[PDB]
Amino acid sequence: MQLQLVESGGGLVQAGGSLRLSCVASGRTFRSNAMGWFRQAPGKEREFVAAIRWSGGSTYYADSVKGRFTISRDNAKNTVYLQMNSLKPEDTAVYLCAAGVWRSSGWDTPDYWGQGTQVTVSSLEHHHHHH
Predict the structure, then answer these.
(1) CB atoms within 10 A of CB 28
(2) If 0-12 CB within 10 Å is exposed, 13-18 middle and 19+ buried, where does residue 126 land?
(3) Beta bridge partners of 111
């Protein structure tokens, strides 16, 4: 059972608004003891935002986003939440989730990564889309 991370919630928010990501793992499947959340950009590799493991606390965030950015694991339906409150206009990038198992050395190994959900934080602006 390989971790296939299906991410959703990707859209445009304004700078100071809240955006929640949800990553459903293979519909409803488990094999990930070590998970994460990373940001990716054109030319820039995935940078550590957060990490969630099997119990122990499972919580990480940057100083510049202290407390506003929060994470949760809901393994009952196998969905991982990234609740980012008050996003900066420079969070216009493609976020992805991480998955994998723990190393016996005590090191954290992201074996899998997400499909890449594009989050676009506009500077206090929005976009209309007619059908």
Answers:
(1) 11
(2) exposed
(3) none
d(CA 117, CA 22): 10
**Integer Cα distance of 35 and 22 in angstroms:** 13
* Nearest Cα to Cα of residue 31 among 5, 68, 60, 62: 5
Cβ neighbours for 64, distance < 8 A, ≥ 6 positions apart: 88
Other beta carbons within 10 angstroms of residue 108's beta carbon come to 15
Rg over CA atoms, the chain: 15
The one-letter amino acid code at 50 reads A
The contacts of residue 18 (CB under 8 Å, 6+ apart) are 83, 84, 85, 86, 87
**What residue type is assigned to position 56 of the chain?**
G
107: which DSSP letter? -
Which residues have CB under 8 Å from 105's CB, separation 6+?
Answer: none
Q: How was this structure determined?
A: NMR
> Tokens in use for 42?
């054109």
